[PDB]
Amino acid sequence: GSMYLRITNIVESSFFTKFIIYLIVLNGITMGLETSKTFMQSFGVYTTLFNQIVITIFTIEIILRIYVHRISFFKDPWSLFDFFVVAISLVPTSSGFEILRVLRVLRLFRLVTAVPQMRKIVSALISVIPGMLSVIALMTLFFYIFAIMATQLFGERFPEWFGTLGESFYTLFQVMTLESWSMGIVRPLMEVYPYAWVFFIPFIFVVTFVMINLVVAIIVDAMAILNQ
Amino acid sequence: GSMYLRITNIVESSFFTKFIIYLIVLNGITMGLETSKTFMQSFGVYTTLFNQIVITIFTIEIILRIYVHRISFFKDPWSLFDFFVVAISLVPTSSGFEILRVLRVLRLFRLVTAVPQMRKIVSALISVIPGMLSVIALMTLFFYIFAIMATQLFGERFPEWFGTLGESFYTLFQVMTLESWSMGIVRPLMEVYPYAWVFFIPFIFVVTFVMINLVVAIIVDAMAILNQ
Amino acid sequence: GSMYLRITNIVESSFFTKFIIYLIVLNGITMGLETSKTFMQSFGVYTTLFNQIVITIFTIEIILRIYVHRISFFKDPWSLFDFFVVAISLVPTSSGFEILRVLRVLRLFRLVTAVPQMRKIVSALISVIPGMLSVIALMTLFFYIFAIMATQLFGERFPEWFGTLGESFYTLFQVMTLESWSMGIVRPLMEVYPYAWVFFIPFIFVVTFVMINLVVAIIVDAMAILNQ
Amino acid sequence: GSMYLRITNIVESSFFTKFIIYLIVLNGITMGLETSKTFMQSFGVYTTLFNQIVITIFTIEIILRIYVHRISFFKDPWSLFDFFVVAISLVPTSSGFEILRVLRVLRLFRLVTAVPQMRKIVSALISVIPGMLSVIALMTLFFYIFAIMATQLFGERFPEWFGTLGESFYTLFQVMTLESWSMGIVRPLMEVYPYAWVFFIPFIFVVTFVMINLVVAIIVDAMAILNQ
Numbered sequence: 026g027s028m029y030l031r032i033t034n035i036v037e038s039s040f041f042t043k044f045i046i047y048l049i050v051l052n053g054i055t056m057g058l059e060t061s062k063t064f065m066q067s068f069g070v071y072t073t074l075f076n077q078i079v080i081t082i083f084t085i086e087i088i089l090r091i092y093v094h095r096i097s098f099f100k101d102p103w104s105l106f107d108f109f110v111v112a113i114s115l116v117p118t119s120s121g122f123e124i125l126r127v128l129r130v131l132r133l134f135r136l137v138t139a140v141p142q143m144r145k146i147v148s149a150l151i152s153v154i155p156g157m158l159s160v161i162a163l164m165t166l167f168f169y170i171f172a173i174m175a176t177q178l179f180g181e182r183f184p185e186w187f188g189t190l191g192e193s194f195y196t197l198f199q200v201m202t203l204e205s206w207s208m209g210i211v212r213p214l215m216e217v218y219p220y221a222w223v224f225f226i227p228f229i230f231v232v233t234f235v236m237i238n239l240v241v242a243i244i245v246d247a248m249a250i251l252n253q
Numbered sequence: 254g255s256m257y258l259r260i261t262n263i264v265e266s267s268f269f270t271k272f273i274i275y276l277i278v279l280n281g282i283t284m285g286l287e288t289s290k291t292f293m294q295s296f297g298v299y300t301t302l303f304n305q306i307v308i309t310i311f312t313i314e315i316i317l318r319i320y321v322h323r324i325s326f327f328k329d330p331w332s333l334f335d336f337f338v339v340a341i342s343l344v345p346t347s348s349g350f351e352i353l354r355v356l357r358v359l360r361l362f363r364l365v366t367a368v369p370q371m372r373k374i375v376s377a378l379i380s381v382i383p384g385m386l387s388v389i390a391l392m393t394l395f396f397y398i399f400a401i402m403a404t405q406l407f408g409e410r411f412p413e414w415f416g417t418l419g420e421s422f423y424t425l426f427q428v429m430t431l432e433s434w435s436m437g438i439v440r441p442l443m444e445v446y447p448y449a450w451v452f453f454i455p456f457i458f459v460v461t462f463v464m465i466n467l468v469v470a471i472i473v474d475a476m477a478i479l480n481q
Numbered sequence: 482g483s484m485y486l487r488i489t490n491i492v493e494s495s496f497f498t499k500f501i502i503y504l505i506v507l508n509g510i511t512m513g514l515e516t517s518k519t520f521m522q523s524f525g526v527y528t529t530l531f532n533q534i535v536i537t538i539f540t541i542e543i544i545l546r547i548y549v550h551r552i553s554f555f556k557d558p559w560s561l562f563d564f565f566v567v568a569i570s571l572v573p574t575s576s577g578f579e580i581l582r583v584l585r586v587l588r589l590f591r592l593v594t595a596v597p598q599m600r601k602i603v604s605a606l607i608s609v610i611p612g613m614l615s616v617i618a619l620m621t622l623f624f625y626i627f628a629i630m631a632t633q634l635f636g637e638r639f640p641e642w643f644g645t646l647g648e649s650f651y652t653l654f655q656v657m658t659l660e661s662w663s664m665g666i667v668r669p670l671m672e673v674y675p676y677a678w679v680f681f682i683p684f685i686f687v688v689t690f691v692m693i694n695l696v697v698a699i700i701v702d703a704m705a706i707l708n709q
Numbered sequence: 710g711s712m713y714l715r716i717t718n719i720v721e722s723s724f725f726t727k728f729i730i731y732l733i734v735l736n737g738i739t740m741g742l743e744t745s746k747t748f749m750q751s752f753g754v755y756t757t758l759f760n761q762i763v764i765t766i767f768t769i770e771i772i773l774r775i776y777v778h779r780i781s782f783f784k785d786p787w788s789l790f791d792f793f794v795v796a797i798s799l800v801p802t803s804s805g806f807e808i809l810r811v812l813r814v815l816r817l818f819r820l821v822t823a824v825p826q827m828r829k830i831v832s833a834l835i836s837v838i839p840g841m842l843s844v845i846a847l848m849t850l851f852f853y854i855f856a857i858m859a860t861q862l863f864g865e866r867f868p869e870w871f872g873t874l875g876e877s878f879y880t881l882f883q884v885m886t887l888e889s890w891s892m893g894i895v896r897p898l899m900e901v902y903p904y905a906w907v908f909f910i911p912f913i914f915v916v917t918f919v920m921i922n923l924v925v926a927i928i929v930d931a932m933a934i935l936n937q
């Protein structure tokens with residue numbers, strides 16, 4: 026209609042989204058203050074009301090957006106994110122997990138999707154990921170196989186670190202980040218299993234060498250984009 | 254013959270290797286569950302049978318592959334790997350080391366050699382290695398010489414870390430990864446040998462500087478490949 | 482006038498700034514010795530006088546520079562820095578914070594602004610920063626949102642690390658540097674909150690992946706400068 | 710003469726240096742065994758004799774080399790290194806420091822100078838250094854200025870880490886490597902000086918950011934070499 030076009034030109038208004046962005050940074054500050062228990066004694070009700078004010082506004086104005094765009098809205102990854110972020114924010118407290126209330130803070134990520142400069146940089150990062158998928162596949166296979174080996178080789182006498190497949194996953198990722206791999210994992214390990222370095226020195230080497238290539242690769246593919 | 258060509262067109266069948274790949278991921282999951290002792294009480298016999306089912310299949314079908322290809326098979330590094338991986342998997346339990354049973358998990362790496370996308374990424378990594386061989390030679394020489402020096406300079410009062418050439422190798426590699434080099438090695442060292450930094454600050458610097466070049470080099474040689 | 486031009490050709494003299502540079506390295510050494518309490522017992526008065534000698538000289542000769550250049554001086558970032566560095570150096574001891582006396586050492590950074598080769602390398606580094614501003618914005622938003630989440634999720638039972646928004650900021654930056662993230666933060670955390678890895682493994686991953694891109698980006702933009 | 714040319718064509722003989730290289734790896738192994746006290750009880754005299762055999766040979770054959778080349782020898786950095794390495798190896802035990810005997814192991818680095826492939830890779834690394842000299846100057850100035858500040862700000866209550874200019878240098882380098890910067894330096898520091906992060910978070914940032922550029926720079930200058 027021209028009703029649909031009236032709503033649409035309010036919805037795609039620059040001011041409309043600048044008001045939204047403004048609502049985001051305001052509520053962002055809000056949530057910064059609600060970590061403080063001092064501030065929460067004084068203005069607990071103030072901030073808890075503002076939070077509801079803004080979330081209804083977001084639901085009001087995602088209703089409007091869906092009107093304007095219908096199917097195309099749900100095929101847009103930025104819009105989808107604002108949907109599922111305001112969704113998890115909608116569910117009320119004391120229903121399901123209580124952890125859902127920390128997830129309310131995800132609303133702030135609307136800033137990324139509402140700002141164009143932020144949307145540009147995110148798309149640039151996400152762009153890189155497809156080229157990485159082979160290396161990620163390889164590395165996951167490598168982690169999985171060594172997790173099993175380490176679980177089997179060390180999980181009985183070292184149950185906190187290797188007693189479980191998932192425990193070995195975590196410990197192995199720790200090692201890969203190089204965080205206390207020697208004086209916190211392998212040197213203790215070796216106190217019982219003196220040849221444990223035979224398992225972990227190669228693990229280090231391979232994991233490192235692969236990550237280097239992961240990065241080198243990303244660089245090359247960015248230069249191949251400039252050279253066209 | 255045309256028998257040889259009949260076997261060969263079953264062996265090079267797409268479906269044939271898709272069945273193999275499928276057998277790999279199945280058994281991969283299997284081995285994930287056999288880390289669990291719960292699952293092993295219930296279905297111990299089930300998984301231990303599946304494992305034998307699949308390994309015979311792999312030996313059956315490496316026999317077929319060798320038939321089809323004979324000498325050319327044993328000059329292919331992917332095929333060779335499947336040979337020596339199914340080989341170490343063949344030897345029965347309680348013969349030789351018992352560690353051979355964790356090595357059975359290496360079978361999962363067949364995924365890398367059976368999948369073409371995985372084979373591509375591995376070849377890409379292995380490609381990089383030849384250019385690195387000079388730097389690796391240098392660094393090994395450097396490690397060896399400092400290992401000796403550190404063994405001699407510190408192995409008596411610090412026998413757990415430097416008492417042996419191999420111990421100093423391990424400790425020096427630890428340092429290179431920067432893992433607790435100061436508050437776990439050098440600062441304790443210095444409690445007795447106050448000028449120990451004179452040995453380790455340069456060691457750090459050289460090792461770091463070389464590794465940077467190792468990487469920078471890899472990058473350049475990848476760009477020299479794009480620029481042709 | 483030609484008075485103004487007489488002062489100006491003394492002020493822009495090569496020798497003039499070589500004398501200044503010389504005054505900087507001398508006083509640099511001075512301040513190296515005044516860390517020593519031995520040296521301060523013997524020559525305390527000597528160095529404390531030299532320091533005043535030189536600072537008056539610097540104020541004398543920033544007066545001259547402002548004469549020669551007036552407004553253009555205050556629109557130059559190198560000159561501005563020498564202004565505010567000699568300014569904070571001017572304020573006398575025991576007025577305001579006492580920390581202002583360590584800030585006197587900032588005078589040595591005049592070397593960067595007085596030497597041309599040093600000025601070149603600093604401008605090269607500062608040049609890089611504008612391209613980084615999107616990624617920095619993103620990362621700050623990401624840090625802020627996870628700081629809040631971590632403050633809320635863990636600040637009661639872990640008040641030293643997550644009890645405050647700013648405490649969580651510091652702890653999260655620690656994690657990003659990978660410094661004791663597992664055996665000093667997450668593994669203790671998990672002793673009470675077993676699913677804490679669900680918060681921190683992703684945090685690691687995202688922070689790392691972004692930093693890689695931060696760097697990769699810098700590289701590309703430097704090559705885009707060579708290719709013109 | 711043609712005597713000089715007779716000696717010269719023995720000295721520049723391929724076999725001559727292959728014999729030398731062979732002497733190096735032999736003695737390299739020797740010195741590996743002399744770390745072992747077992748081996749030193751049995752063959753102490755054997756290895757200690759071999760060591761003298763080879764060093765005289767090296768002095769014999771650096772005499773020959775100097776004959777062949779005279780001044781040009783002493784303007785070659787590879788030859789110079791073999792001079793000063795065999796020199797420090799010449800001085801006998803129990804004269805001066807005893808540390809001179811560990812320096813005997815430096816002889817093994819003759820491998821780098823005697824092998825051409827090794828000489829190539831070393832020259833490639835050393836090549837990189839000139840471009841780095843500005844950044845190194847800057848960073849040294851930065852380290853020095855913060856060392857002083859940290860010595861003054863923290864050396865009284867933290868004398869093991871900051872009580873001395875050189876102590877602060879070491880601690881600051883530790884921080885730069887990120888080794889236990891938080892749970893081993895700054896968090897303890899903060900127990901007394903709660904605003905200590907104001908000094909160290911910026912220090913981290915600047916040091917990191919500079920090192921990135923140090924590396925990025927090296928990459929660019931290597932590509933500028935390929936693009937000619």
Ligand SMILES: CCCCCCCCCCCCCC(=O)OC[C@H](COP(=O)(O)OCC[N+](C)(C)C)OC(=O)CCCCCCCCCCCCC
Pocket residue numbers: 049050051052053054057058060061062063064133136621625645646647648650
């Ligand atoms: C479009 C441009 C937007 C520009 C925004 C830039 C934002 C950059 C991040 C700013 C970080 C703020 C500094 C900070 O984290 O402060 C730490 C303090 C210390 O804790 P504090 O609560 O004082 O503890 C005292 C004891 N207590 C609880 C009993 C009162 O904790 C507090 O006191 C709470 C202070 C909350 C300040 C929140 C400021 C953030 C601005 C909004 C961020 C953008 C939202 C999308």
Ligand SMILES: CCCCCCCCCCCCCC(=O)OC[C@H](COP(=O)(O)OCC[N+](C)(C)C)OC(=O)CCCCCCCCCCCCC
Pocket residue numbers: 154161164165168185189190191192194195198671675676678682
């Ligand atoms: C953009 C494309 C994708 C990006 C890359 C990420 C994809 C790969 C991620 C790993 C996939 C597998 C996930 C997995 O195995 O998780 C299982 C475990 C189960 O945890 P659980 O046993 O409940 O907890 C263990 C800790 N505990 C008991 C001491 C409290 O959960 C853990 O606790 C382990 C934590 C995960 C370790 C990280 C493994 C990384 C795999 C290699 C990735 C290379 C990155 C380049």
Ligand SMILES: CCCCCCCCCCCCCC(=O)OC[C@H](COP(=O)(O)OCC[N+](C)(C)C)OC(=O)CCCCCCCCCCCCC
Pocket residue numbers: 165169189190191192194277278279280281282285286288289290291292361364
């Ligand atoms: C071609 C596409 C293939 C796609 C596959 C992608 C695979 C990515 C890695 C997946 C990682 C699986 C998650 C994981 O590690 O779980 C940790 C759990 C926790 O230990 P759990 O055994 O529950 O401990 C409970 C106590 N207990 C032992 C008495 C029962 O440990 C377990 O409960 C055992 C769970 C085993 C799950 C195995 C799933 C891996 C899929 C196959 C991998 C490919 C093989 C080549």
Ligand SMILES: CCCCCCCCCCCCCC(=O)OC[C@H](COP(=O)(O)OCC[N+](C)(C)C)OC(=O)CCCCCCCCCCCCC
Pocket residue numbers: 215219220222226382389392393396413417418419420422423426
């Ligand atoms: C793709 C081309 C090749 C890839 C690069 C790898 C080649 C170089 C690897 C090192 C070669 C030398 C191997 C070696 O020296 O190993 C001897 C020692 C003997 O161990 P052992 O004395 O039985 O155990 C010591 C630990 N303990 C007693 C406290 C339980 O074994 C150890 O425990 C030491 C562990 C090895 C330390 C790593 C040394 C790296 C050398 C520099 C490589 C630079 C990489 C870019």
Ligand SMILES: CCCCCCCCCCCCCC(=O)OC[C@H](COP(=O)(O)OCC[N+](C)(C)C)OC(=O)CCCCCCCCCCCCC
Pocket residue numbers: 505506507508509510513514516517518519520589592849853873874875876878
């Ligand atoms: C344009 C070209 C300029 C070239 C300059 C290159 C500068 C490079 C950095 C040099 C670093 C100097 C070495 C250093 O940090 O020495 C540590 C010593 C050890 O502490 P020390 O004070 O001996 O402790 C003994 C006990 N005590 C206090 C009771 C006496 O601490 C001391 O004894 C104090 C020694 C102060 C030496 C200062 C030398 C720096 C030169 C000026 C730097 C340039 C200024 C812009």
Ligand SMILES: CCCCCCCCCCCCCC(=O)OC[C@H](COP(=O)(O)OCC[N+](C)(C)C)OC(=O)CCCCCCCCCCCCC
Pocket residue numbers: 610617620621624641645646647648650651654899903904906910
């Ligand atoms: C050239 C363009 C800009 C360069 C990038 C830098 C800009 C971003 C810096 C962070 C901005 C926000 C600053 C902020 O939130 O500071 C608040 C807190 C308040 O400290 P406070 O609560 O007084 O002290 C906590 C420690 N305590 C209690 C145990 C003694 O202060 C702290 O103690 C936290 C220390 C800061 C943590 C670093 C956060 C980094 C944000 C992400 C930056 C990514 C870098 C690529």
Ligand SMILES: CCCCCCCCCCCCCC(=O)OC[C@H](COP(=O)(O)OCC[N+](C)(C)C)OC(=O)CCCCCCCCCCCCC
Pocket residue numbers: 393397417418419420422733734735736737738741742744745746747748817820
């Ligand atoms: C041109 C091509 C040259 C190719 C050479 C490649 C060299 C690569 C590095 C090889 C590293 C050798 C492995 C290693 O570090 O072994 C650690 C062992 C363990 O200590 P060990 O002495 O067995 O301790 C037992 C207790 N004890 C002392 C009472 C007997 O310590 C020992 O038992 C001593 C073993 C010494 C073996 C030395 C082998 C190095 C070859 C020469 C290196 C080139 C010299 C330039």
Ligand SMILES: CCCCCCCCCCCCCC(=O)OC[C@H](COP(=O)(O)OCC[N+](C)(C)C)OC(=O)CCCCCCCCCCCCC
Pocket residue numbers: 443447448450454838845848849852869873874875876878879882
């Ligand atoms: C290829 C071109 C050149 C390569 C770059 C290297 C040039 C710069 C190196 C540093 C120059 C200044 C040297 C210096 O200040 O050393 C003084 C101190 C004095 O040590 P001292 O007070 O006897 O021992 C302290 C430890 N203690 C008491 C607890 C046992 O000695 C130490 O103990 C401190 C150890 C040195 C810390 C490293 C400082 C690095 C400066 C920034 C370099 C950036 C690298 C990219």
Ligand SMILES: CCCCCCCCCCCCO[C@@H]1O[C@H](CO)[C@@H](O[C@H]2O[C@H](CO)[C@@H](O)[C@H](O)[C@H]2O)[C@H](O)[C@H]1O
Pocket residue numbers: 178179217218219220221222223224227351352
């Ligand atoms: C790139 C290729 C991949 C390389 C991967 C190869 C990994 C090599 C594995 C080396 C493992 C070293 O770890 C090794 O673990 C076994 C566990 O059975 C120990 O074995 C020891 O403990 C077990 C209990 O678990 C006892 O039953 C056994 O009698 C005893 O010797 C070894 O003493 C230890 O040194």
Ligand SMILES: CCCCCCCCCCCCO[C@@H]1O[C@H](CO)[C@@H](O[C@H]2O[C@H](CO)[C@@H](O)[C@H](O)[C@H]2O)[C@H](O)[C@H]1O
Pocket residue numbers: 406407445446447448449450451452455807808
């Ligand atoms: C890039 C070039 C390569 C640089 C490599 C040069 C390495 C320099 C070596 C510095 C070593 C410092 O380590 C130094 O070790 C010797 C060991 O003899 C110590 O010496 C001390 O211990 C030994 C026992 O072992 C005693 O016999 C001796 O009387 C005592 O002084 C020094 O107090 C310590 O400071």
Ligand SMILES: CCCCCCCCCCCCO[C@@H]1O[C@H](CO)[C@@H](O[C@H]2O[C@H](CO)[C@@H](O)[C@H](O)[C@H]2O)[C@H](O)[C@H]1O
Pocket residue numbers: 123124634635673674675676677678679680683
């Ligand atoms: C890229 C996407 C971003 C991913 C970010 C998602 C973060 C996921 C959060 C996982 C957090 C895990 O941390 C989780 O913290 C909560 C705190 O309520 C704990 O919950 C526990 O402690 C709290 C007290 O604080 C009790 O009230 C509660 O009954 C108890 O279960 C969980 O046992 C712990 O595992």
Ligand SMILES: CCCCCCCCCCCCO[C@@H]1O[C@H](CO)[C@@H](O[C@H]2O[C@H](CO)[C@@H](O)[C@H](O)[C@H]2O)[C@H](O)[C@H]1O
Pocket residue numbers: 579580862863901902903904905906907908911
């Ligand atoms: C990029 C720009 C460079 C940024 C560099 C700026 C560095 C900023 C310095 C912040 C230092 C924080 O460290 C600060 O040290 C002083 C030391 O006087 C402490 O001060 C405290 O200790 C001293 C003793 O030494 C007492 O005399 C004083 O009364 C007390 O307040 C502060 O409580 C602490 O927080």
Ligand SMILES: [Ca+2]
Pocket residue numbers: 203204205431432433659660661887888889
């Ligand atoms: Ca660490």
